[PDB]
Design a protein around this ligand. Sequence first.
Ligand SMILES: Nc1ncnc2c1ncn2[C@@H]1O[C@H](COP(=O)(O)OP(=O)(O)OP(=O)(O)O)[C@@H](O)[C@H]1O
Ligand SMILES: Nc1ncnc2c1ncn2[C@@H]1O[C@H](COP(=O)(O)OP(=O)(O)O)[C@@H](O)[C@H]1O
Ligand SMILES: Nc1ncnc2c1ncn2[C@@H]1O[C@H](COP(=O)(O)OP(=O)(O)O)[C@@H](O)[C@H]1O
Ligand SMILES: Nc1ncnc2c1ncn2[C@@H]1O[C@H](COP(=O)(O)OP(=O)(O)O)[C@@H](O)[C@H]1O
Lengths: 578, 379
Amino acid sequence: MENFTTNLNQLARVGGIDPLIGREKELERAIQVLCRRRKNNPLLVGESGVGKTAIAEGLAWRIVQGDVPEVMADCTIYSLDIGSLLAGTKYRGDFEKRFKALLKQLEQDTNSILFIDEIHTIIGAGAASGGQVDAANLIKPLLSSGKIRVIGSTTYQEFSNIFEKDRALARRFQKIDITEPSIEETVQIINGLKPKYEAHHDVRYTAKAVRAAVELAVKYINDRHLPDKAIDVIDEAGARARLMPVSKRKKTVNVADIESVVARIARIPEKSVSQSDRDTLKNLGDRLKMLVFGQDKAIEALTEAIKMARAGLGHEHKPVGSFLFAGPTGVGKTEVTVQLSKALGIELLRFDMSEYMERHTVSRLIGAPPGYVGFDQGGLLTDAVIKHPHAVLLLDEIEKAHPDVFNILLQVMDNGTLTDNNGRKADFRNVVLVMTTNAGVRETERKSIGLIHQDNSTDAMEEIKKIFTPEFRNRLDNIIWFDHLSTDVIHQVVDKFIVELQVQLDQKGVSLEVSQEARNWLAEKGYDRAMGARPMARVIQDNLKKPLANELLFGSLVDGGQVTVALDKEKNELTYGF
Amino acid sequence: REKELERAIQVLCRRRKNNPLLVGESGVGKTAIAEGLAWRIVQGDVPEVMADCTIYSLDIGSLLAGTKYRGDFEKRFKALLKQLEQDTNSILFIDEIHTIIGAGAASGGQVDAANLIKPLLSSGKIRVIGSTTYQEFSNIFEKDRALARRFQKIDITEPSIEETVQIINGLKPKYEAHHDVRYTAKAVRAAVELAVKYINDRHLPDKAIDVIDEAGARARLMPVSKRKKTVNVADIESVVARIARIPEKSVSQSDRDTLKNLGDRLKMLVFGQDKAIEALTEAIKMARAGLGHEHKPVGSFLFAGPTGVGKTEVTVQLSKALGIELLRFDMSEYMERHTVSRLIGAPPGYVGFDQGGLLTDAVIKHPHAVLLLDEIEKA
Ligand SMILES: Nc1ncnc2c1ncn2[C@@H]1O[C@H](COP(=O)(O)OP(=O)(O)OP(=O)(O)O)[C@@H](O)[C@H]1O
Ligand SMILES: Nc1ncnc2c1ncn2[C@@H]1O[C@H](COP(=O)(O)OP(=O)(O)O)[C@@H](O)[C@H]1O
Ligand SMILES: Nc1ncnc2c1ncn2[C@@H]1O[C@H](COP(=O)(O)OP(=O)(O)O)[C@@H](O)[C@H]1O
Ligand SMILES: Nc1ncnc2c1ncn2[C@@H]1O[C@H](COP(=O)(O)OP(=O)(O)O)[C@@H](O)[C@H]1O
């Protein structure tokens, strides 16, 4: 074992092992497990950046320091990796002999403990040099009899793939749950390692830089457990400090240098790491009021709710917001969402719920079960958010979605996340969730009976309460009701449609002047509150696009030029030559 | 579990479909029985039917080790079966019978190991004792008639409280010797009595024992056994709690005062409706007092009131106050008949496959829970 197993206690004596910071209960469990007769081989099971190996080394350090009771103090912890014994590529003549030499020496020294990092290498695996399945089988009897003790190292997902599949370990080993350290501990961990970064990069880190690397990494980097996200910031700040300033050569890394690299590591703007866009948010309501007319309270409800989320009044785990838009048709409930994403400068992820009416929607939104085509997709919903965690997400006409989609949505509204079928998760915290419904368009066309008409409208949102259950409705920030639009709105709608018509005409080299009276008339001609703004697109198409198309194709407008439309005293559209 | 040993024997005594299979789940003691069958033989406590028969445990590890080539796994395995077939009244015990179904110990070894056994079972050359689980049985034996019709299904269940205490006392001296400790009568009963209250997801034979092992081991590791060799119920409480985190603070408090104090604790969180919370307290006491039947619910109460008045909050506080889970369902979502089946886990219209009932699962996972059904007039 002389050139095969690393003595961790010796590295701790040498100084190869950095003192463990915190983790007193994790170490206590490892020793509590090691001191037992059965299930007496601990497994440090976690995720990346938790330090599970650092803890195992940390235990060897405590064994050496004598911070544990003699049962374990002065025992020897050695570590086996995939570098020394896996060199037996000439097979068993090298491998079996070196492998068994360890077992025999370790069997003789019953106060010897091995640490096996990346333990999945052997458990649930066992190849390498073609020696590890039985090498594991040759360790197991000695762990059972108490001749050799073993500390493992794995992750929660690997654990279920390797431990839960082998009863030899179920009776020999015990899981210890390893999670991330505190913020303070992370800073202390950085300070322990800091000099290594300083030495590599020829930089020096301030006290504020190390505190900030941990704090800033938490605020924006969602990739790893605290030690790793903070370290990349320190290592990146260090490196940038020695690369960028060729003409300046600053060595000291301060909070400002952390802010620059965190922004880059975290995939956010160099400004936004500290300074958010206060003004795009202040101006949101007006930019939208200029595009979707008449829905002023709806825009304000949306605008204010977003600002509250952006102002930090809400929960750090939840979506930016969640709204179910409802109202009559042709009122802008989707148009405002589309314009919302543009106004905010945020990519729009759009899912049309009509495409998900079956109970197999999940197989496409989340992903197919393993063994089926499509298991490779992480889910259309989940993948879109993972690649675009900062997004406006639209679920168009949600009342048509199959009810199973609500289990997906209820989870996101409660926890801000959604896992895929491969164990990865979407982060919806920077996603604005808007879903629209036409349950609210149900109304009648029939009037009251009598000489005098009276308003016989039904109660708003009763139809929503009958479609969406309280579980789904109580998780919304709001339900934003859109009203039928008025004739004043129509005049504004006609103006934007005339402009759109002109944009199309500009591409033909044609300038169109529509008189005010022509607009006033069309606005009146096409109005129907029941169908919202739809009809206006239609009346404009019927009265202006028809004549223009005929001229653009066969007549005077074919070459580009100036066309105008006047309203007749007789309410006809009068057109110009060119 | 003497009848289990006898049942395996009655199967070994048959001429066809004469290979007993011990079918269990983790912690029931199915391995212990197989060990017990070998034990009875070594002590001569067997019928002549078995004569002086030797039960051997298939060692897939040893068959694979040092080679990992199909040719060597096979010459050793086939030689094994030949020698086992040759022994008079031979019995092959296969522990982990559900794991050799692949290739013995590993891919690269004998991929046909199950296939080499099938014909001996068919001829009855070696009586074979298997060891599988309830869940694996249908994926190992029912899977292939060459085994389904060669083995008998013997259902192994967990032992009683008293039997586990006897198991602890049987093994206790080993733990006392292993960890330089002694266990009180209360400690051995407590490892059993408390494991069944706080462990929840494992059978008693392993967990009362883990608790004994850990109390001993913990006392050896900490400077306790050096002086305080004795492990009493107090040490057991710390040990079960070590993982469960319950008994060290809640193994016993008062089964009378934690109920009386319910009336007043509810008043600290929910304000007003004092009589409603007292009525619940009274009903709970009557149930605790033993007024009712073993098949009946602890209790059932309809909470009528305005919304937003804490009907839920009282229910939440009852669950917290009583140390139990809260299960919730909204009856307005169970207004239609199909959804009703989803709730029940009725043979038709259930959830998923193993997700069957929503209510059946909720009541199985959390059997001591308080179940809240909202707005039942909409059900
Ligand atoms: N309030 C509005 N102001 C200006 N233009 C509008 C308004 N509503 C709609 N429009 C225009 O009419 C068209 C239809 O709008 P939109 O797609 O948003 O309807 P909707 O809210 O989705 O209702 P539904 O889905 O039931 O049809 C769009 O091209 C849009 O530009
Ligand atoms: N208690 C600790 N003391 C010092 N450093 C720690 C501690 N815990 C974690 N770390 C740091 O976390 C890293 C080790 O964990 P790591 O190897 O990244 O886990 P994983 O293998 O799952 O990715 C090291 O950078 C280590 O310094
Ligand atoms: N009937 C029994 N009598 C005594 N000890 C038992 C009994 N059954 C199980 N045990 C012990 O409880 C632990 C788990 O039993 P085990 O045979 O491994 O079942 P499983 O592997 O299915 O969980 C073991 O330590 C075992 O020795
Ligand atoms: N009796 C009560 N004591 C304290 N808070 C209450 C009480 N009743 C209602 N509330 C509060 O009113 C809100 C709704 O109460 P809750 O029971 O959770 O939902 P529901 O309206 O369905 O009963 C909550 O903020 C709750 O705290």
